[PDB]
């Protein structure tokens, strides 16, 4: 749901 690292729900995050 963030966006930095991997990638979330629905972001390129995830922390």
Do not use: I, K, S, Y
């Not at 749901?1 to 922390?15: I, K, R, S, T």
């Amino acid at each position: 749901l963030v966006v930095a690292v991997q990638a979330d729900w629905n972001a390129p995050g995830w922390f």
